[PDB]
Design an enzyme around this catalytic site. Structure first.
Site: not given
Lengths: 192, 192, 192, 192, 192, 192, 192, 192, 192, 192
Positions: G96-97, G170, G67, G121
């Site tokens: 990621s987040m 990624d 997000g 990422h």
């Protein structure tokens, strides 16, 4: 698709379009809604025909559900400017603008088919914005309505008051009714 | 795409379109919905053919699901105005407007293919607005319905009352039924 | 569809378009919204006509609801650059840009049909972005408004103050009003 | 629609388009947004004109709101490659790309109409993706901005620092301002 | 619109298109995204030019933002198959496919304009479906990436490892950078 | 909407929704597509039921057509983590993810209704981007496929090769067939 | 919908929703995309739990695909600001987040399910506009990427250079792989 | 969905929402785009808190990307109007409007988390219409820009020229930078 | 999503909404576009407050960009009809309709926050139809404009002519300017 | 949203919404377009109030731009059927249907605010289909127009012819004008 016709002249054969061929015979078609492009196209044809022969009558077939008023005025003004008498013939139907141009033809040369219909109504319009702008546009359309009524009375021969009452709401007139109303001159049933 | 044909004449070869070539033989095609543009195009062809030879019959193949009424009236009026007899031939199908024009052909020259279908129904329309406007348009369409029925009876030979009852709802008639109903004259099965 | 005309010259027949034929007679049509493509097309015609004969007047029929300002300036600048006098004729209507070009014609050669309308208003525009950018664009449009008013006063002969007051809101002027306002020179009712 | 013109030569008549006819006179039109197709088309015209006569000047009318930068570079590079001097004329308006090409014309042969506008601003762009990709694209556009500023200073004669300050935000310049800014050479008011 | 040009030959005048005229001079344009139709069109031009003269060099101007890979391979394969040396010239910009074709030209005949940009990146693609299908498509695109890198190294002269590192992410190279990188041969600033 | 029921519990009378009432009895419903939001809701219910009685069996009805693997895997991990056994009952349909959770139940506690359908297929995915990114996602989806196959073999008892071979394409298994394959333990026809 | 559960306490029987029930035990759910609205909801819960008991650890279940970075940073700052240790558990997946927040828990209290997938990422963004403003945003994303990598390295324990190399593209890590990489402390497979 | 919480008090049990519970503690959340509806909710909360106890500070958490200026000013005036000190805490990010409200808190009570982004830029707007209307809106937006700059300088303590120069374009400031710039007073990294 | 508050009284704890709680204090919020539904809600609140205490003053905070004239007039009539004096406070903005209600408050009780914009413009309308219908609607809006100006002149104290000239076009006013004009009579800087 | 109010009673405090609170006082709100669903609510409320006190009056606030005629007639019939006299108050506006219900109140109990507009026009409808169906629907709407005119004439007290001529087109009436016409009986300016 537009069919192609051939003209047999002494000089030789010549390929022509169905509409172009009729144009050579002083015949103009007014079909579809009256817009600026189509109206401008008709104006050019009238000027070209006048130069070729300013003494031969011009035939204008009207079959349209009406359209822009400014566009129609150009055609109406051009007809009253060129010396040749523009004979208007109504085919299928004639709306407010179509009827206005139909009655604008030369006196005694306005014809309508037996099953053709004619509709006359007051101008349509509208505007969105400030109250000051609305008043300006409201007055403008009202002037157009008055000007249109005066011209209709001049060609139809009816009183200005009568035209206003009949134009307040859509009025449908058949070929016999148009003749009695002065909108046209006669009816073309069969070729004599 | 429209195929191109060649005509071998004494003067020389001439490139023609499949539709244009048939037009030279006094053949007109009425395909698709009956609108103002297509109807206006047919009117031009009829006038051109009349000028070329006002004594030879004109053939009008009808294959359309119907369309605008005003547009059809122009074609009907033109057919009844030009001296040449317009022979109407039904191919595929003939809707209310198609059937009306089909039966409008010259008496004894209205043909229909054995597998062609014919559909007749009352006029379709509508309007949205004030009650006063609805009444005006309601009366107009009713007059068109009555006028159409009178013309159908005149060409078909049936009584006006019979036409009204049959036109209240869609009525499908085959080639043999159309002949007995007076809508057509004969059928074209094979070339003699 | 554009009808095809024929020109009978000593050299021989020549196929021409309705618009192309009139172009050969030093006649240019300005129809539809004033955009870059249409405006650029008109500029080419003016240059071509000047080369053919820099002494014969050029006729520019105006029938448009207005459009881009930059596009109109190119036409206005070209008219003031070519030696031939550009006679502007108003057909149907003349919006802000149409009216600006109409009054930009050679003095004494600006005509308007009796039923033609003319509308004059201040420039329209807008921008979305940062306050700094808004100020830059706001100043730019204001300069254009001032420049347009100065040119209108020069051609119309009215005072700059009067033009500003009349251009604050849409102002409709008929043919007689345009003559008194100095926007045009005379009216073309009938051919003498 | 593109009007058709006729060229009267000793060999005989020749049908030409309004744009094609002017091309024969070493005149190129740059209208609309600067894209790859339109820009590529202009490049072909320049090469063709050079082959016909590498000693006669080429006229390039500019009226566009700007467009892609890569497309404009091809035009700019082609102008600097062909021996003939490309005379740029601004009609209506000249955006960042239009102004860049306008000032790229041969020194002393860059003209602008009195009412023409000119706008100069830094390159516009954007990219969506990973941070690494954003940095690459951000650097690329920055290099283009620097390269564009250097070229503008070279043709305009202004200092690189001054160009950067003026190009940070949209800057509108009229014909008199462009002359003083070095963007153009003179103004074409009337033909002498 | 495509302007029309005239070729003055001993046999007589000949009407040609701007693109067709240049084609007669062994010049091919590669504009827009590289698709199957445009790529197939270029292949036909190369074959036609080879038959006319398999000894004269062919010029291929490249100005495109890239496109399909399979389409580019057809052009690349055709260039390496025809005996004539295909001289590639970069105008405006050269994307992954454009750059690949640009460097695929004959050694010593690959040129780029001073302000032209070049971008090289790995193949782009994607697939949706079962894991088994994803593996198949994933392997296919990987093979194409390896094949593209090998060809780039062969023409550019750089090591395969260096090409892979530089092609992992979009890389922008100017005209001077392309020369040093081996992507092109020289630059065309002015005509000598 | 969801009906509300009342439970005559000791010391009072409480009204709960149909789903909440069954939850109090260690019954969880898994309906619709498997997503993060619904998956977390099921995980929360399973954790809550463990607190009330970490020894009583938990029931999980499966009637989902499948969904995201990550969301479904969260439920599978919770099922194998909490001490209470999870009894899975298949009602209606059970797709890949739904079937995977069906086999995740405790040995001897996996049931299925007589007229129930179970479909097992390999993971479905997709990605679009650079070739390097495609390989990363292509490898991950393949690893997920292998991981799921290993879990299916562990619960169903079939060899890993058999699961991989049978999972290449959609495999529909009825209730009796699921027992033989090992997906479920028994079939519930009537209470005994 | 959200099932309702009953909690037995000294006061009596109280009705709680599934999520609210687990909130009493210091359990917070982080499901779906990370945004400002959901981020503030988690921040409010963390602050509420701190006041209730600032000595008991807080459990945060992370199951999300990523997000907004700013929204996620609000949760990260709150977790580090509040004295109570925040235990992060990965269910299903952690993008990621989500992965950043997963590794942001108190050292030794970070867990991951056996079948959970963790992907990390670099930040993704984008901006459209001028070259000056894009440089600002392009320079800000890099700062976020650098700051994000520094925090990731501090919590994971690996060198900053290693994090940058692995975060360039990624990278998917399984539950065991996440332990070696330092993103998680242990794996929860069964309750003991 | 907002989780429910229970507040145990000697008087009795009570239930509150996550946000409602924090409201009792004089805490207001400002999340999402700034608009009139959300702004009024914040204004109502401030008025309610003032009535309950006008001698206690009010904490406002700002996390938004900005929004309407009128809505934002409605909150700024409320903060200064009510005598209680309104403490502002930045979580996640604070855009132009958010940053303006962040710095509008009582001196010494403006805090920001270690990982937070603060962006300040001039007001953004736009208007389309007549040139006269553009000047009215253009002058108003400029006044708002000047008014906001004056308020920013007063709270931050920077000079008017410095604020204008820094606010001309987007300026991202980290938490440590916001302290030096004066937007905030201190940074809250841990609870002591 | 609106927060809940608790009111302490001898009866016991009472739950209220943020807006409902402020209603007890005779505070009404006017936000968003003015419409019939929201207007009726305000009318009901005003009538309800009058019954509770027809002597205490009501505080109607106005923050709206305007709306329907008919909906606004219902609020204006209700405020003047009810015996209590309605105090209007402008926060954020007050457009034409919003400004009219702001100035409709009792003398000496029309407040405005230090940073708030007041816009006063003539009514906006529009109609599409026949010329007769346009005149009716065009004349009706003019009466509303005249009636609206008279009411504003009475409350502001300015002459009718002054209001008409100022309201002819959009006119923005600040908190201090509104005091001199007469829309308000004081500014609420800080609570005293 | 709709606020909640507390009504003080001997038994205790009770919570009702703003609209429900006014319902107890025999007040009904008629807002928005009239439809079947909203009409039933008014009918149900009127019937409910009759049972509570078949002697006390019922107040109906009308503020709406008209609506369906059938839905409005249900309210009119219910208004006349119930013994209690229904007092109608016009707030904001009252279109055709709204005006019909406004004038349908008990004699001497029809009021209107000083600043309100009343509009009356003939019914608006429309139907598309067969000509036979058009006549059926056309006659039905005509009967409704005549029936509504008779009812309006009876309540207003004017002749049927006057209503027909006045209602032929949209007619706007102010508060004082409505009293003279007979739609209302008095005007409520201030509470005595």
């Amino acid at each position: 698709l537009v069919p192609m016709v051939i003209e047999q002249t002494s000089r030789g054969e010549r390929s022509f379009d169905i509409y172009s061929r009729l144009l050579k015979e002083r015949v103009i078609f007014l079909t579809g809604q009256v817009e600026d492009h189509m109206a401008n196209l008709i104006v050019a044809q009238m000027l070209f025909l006048e130069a070729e022969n300013p003494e031969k009558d011009i035939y204008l077939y009207i079959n349209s559900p009406g359209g822009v008023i400014t566009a129609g005025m150009s055609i109406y003004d051009t007809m009253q400017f060129i010396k040749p008498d523009v004979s208007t013939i109504c085919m299928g139907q004639a709306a407010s603008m179509g009827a206005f141009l139909l009655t604008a033809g030369a006196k005694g040369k306005r014809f309508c088919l037996p099953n053709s219909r004619v509709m006359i109504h007051q101008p349509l319009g509208g505007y969105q914005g400030q109250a000051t702008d609305i008043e300006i546009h409201a007055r403008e359309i009202l002037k157009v309505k008055g000007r249109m009524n005066e011209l209709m009375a001049l060609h139809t021969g009816q009183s200005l008051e009568q035209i206003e009452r009949d134009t307040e709401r859509d009025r449908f007139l058949s070929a016999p009714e148009a003749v009695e109303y002065g909108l046209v001159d006669s009816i073309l049933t069969h070729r004599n």
